[PDB]
């Protein structure tokens, strides 16, 4: 039934400054801005506290599937804050039993050529979502590093190269190859 | 025994179980047997000699190899000694219906059974061991015409005699 009220709080840290034009949070700090719109979620994004310390999200007269959004907005702002402060760092290790998936970034991070996958002549070119920047790591041999602020864009770009390197018309239990996400960490930990 | 073929002393033990008689299906030697100088048919005959005249209703066989001479012994299992102290002995081939008569008393005979346990059990003496071996019996069914379960609780004997 209609729950008379639900809410939550999102305690912003003193480094970051968040601001909300209505229902369109914009979060800025060390690394950069991250806007996100929630016109489509239907909530009261109050912002309270001197020093602007916490973001509150009411949701009045919600039914079960309307009250399910409350936390997911709150959480999306949490990631947004993390992105601004620390920034996300997805690491993905290449795997093969023969053909050593030859990776090479191109423009800056943007492009990812993925040559010699399974001994295929086809060279996979994979763009990155605006903001994300791939880079071939050191201190680990067959391993990529995708860094960026907007987690959504990062993890999508990770998937983009994960599904790029897919095996068709074979026993995938046998043929375990491709560039898989190994670790979802941050650019700096504190 | 490590590099090629050398006996420095050889008092090597390995645990076989079951051995009423010779056994056609055997499986006595191989693997462990031939490498280590113990043969096959002679080792089976020596195993029959030790585990001959009781027990003929399953036995245990620790095999201490002294270079070529095996020393077979009967280390006691609780249910085996109960089946040894049954209404003997209709050995093999009828038989047949089956080996589960299980009305053979043993009141003070199980006192010897709890005594012959190789310490073990992490016990507070026979008071608790009496409860264990009085239930190990799948067949026996305790005294004259009793049950096992809760008659065990009211024991009035052999607390100080079993150490």
């Amino acid at each position: 039934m209609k729950t008379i009220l639900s809410n939550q709080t999102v305690d912003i840290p003193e480094n970051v400054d968040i601001s909300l034009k209505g229902r369109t949070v914009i979060v800025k700090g060390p690394r950069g801005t991250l806007r996100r719109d929630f016109n489509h979620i239907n909530v009261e994004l109050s912002l309270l506290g001197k020093k602007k310390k916490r973001l509150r999200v009411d949701k009045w007269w919600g039914n079960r599937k309307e009250l399910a959004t409350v936390r997911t907005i709150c959480s999306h702002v949490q990631n947004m804050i993390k992105g601004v402060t620390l920034g996300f760092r997805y690491k993905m290790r290449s795997v093969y039993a023969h053909f050593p998936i030859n990776v090479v970034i191109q423009e800056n991070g943007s492009l990812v050529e993925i040559r010699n996958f399974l001994g295929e002549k086809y060279i996979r070119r994979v763009r990155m979502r605006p903001g994300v920047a791939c880079s071939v790591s050191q201190a680990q041999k067959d391993e990529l590093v995708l860094e960026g602020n907007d987690i959504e864009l990062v993890s999508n770009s990770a998937a983009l190269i994960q599904q790029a390197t897919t095996v068709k018309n074979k026993d995938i239990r046998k043929f375990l190859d491709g560039i898989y996400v190994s670790e979802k960490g941050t650019v700096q930990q504190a | 025994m490590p590099p090629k073929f050398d006996p420095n002393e050889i008092k090597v033990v390995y645990l076989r179980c079951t051995g009423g008689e010779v056994g056609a299906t055997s499986a006595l030697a191989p693997k462990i047997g031939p490498l280590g100088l113990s043969p096959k048919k002679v080792g089976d005959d020596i195993a029959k000699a030790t585990g001959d005249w009781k027990g003929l209703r399953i036995t245990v066989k620790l095999t201490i190899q002294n270079r070529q001479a095996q020393i077979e012994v009967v280390p006691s299992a609780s249910a085996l000694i109960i089946k040894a102290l049954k209404e003997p002995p209709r050995d093999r081939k009828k038989q047949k219906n089956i080996k589960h008569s299980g009305n053979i008393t043993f009141d003070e005979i199980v006192n010897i059974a709890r005594q012959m346990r190789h310490r073990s059990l992490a016990r507070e003496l026979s008071g608790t061991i009496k409860e264990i071996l009085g239930t190990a019996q799948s067949v026996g069914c305790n005294v004259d015409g009793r049950h096992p379960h809760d008659i065990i609780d009211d024991i009035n004997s052999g607390a100080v005699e079993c150490p």
Partner: protein, 52 residues
Amino acid sequence: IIEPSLRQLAQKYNCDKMICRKCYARLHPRAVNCRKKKCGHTNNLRPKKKVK
């Protein structure tokens, strides 16, 4: 051939999955019900058979 921790990482993505008994949908291994509206969230699931 292939580094063990690296292998188990690629298993996680390819082979550590539940499968729907109605519609063959490949599902995360924690799954109790299916994804698929086509089979009505069946719940008859089985694990994906391991390579011997």
